[PDB]
């Protein structure tokens, strides 16, 4: 089966992320990163306030269906 995660950008973009529960969240981060055409070191993914690691997974973070993910941008200074 597939899980649908709600990733929203600060611009108000909602992406229909069709991913599984065992698929690494790292791939998810890169996907949106490439989608908008930005660098992975430029954006920060937060799940329920907690930052998502490259070793994290939906099944690990106990992410349920229709779970929301916030994407912040790295401060320049």
């Amino acid at each position: 089966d597939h899980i649908n995660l709600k990733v929203a950008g600060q611009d108000g973009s909602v992406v229909q992320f069709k991913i599984k529960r065992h698929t690494p969240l790292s791939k998810l981060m890169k996907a949106y990163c490439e989608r908008q055409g930005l660098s992975m070191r430029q954006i920060r993914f937060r799940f329920d306030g907690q930052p998502i690691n490259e070793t994290d997974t939906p099944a690990q973070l106990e992410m349920e269906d229709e779970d929301t993910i916030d994407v912040f941008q790295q401060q320049t200074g």
Binding site: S13, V14, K18, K27
Partner: peptide
């Protein structure tokens, strides 16, 4: 409403 669709590839 702005919607962007992303499909993920999962390795078996």
């Amino acid at each position: 409403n702005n919607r962007d669709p992303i499909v993920i590839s999962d390795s078996p």
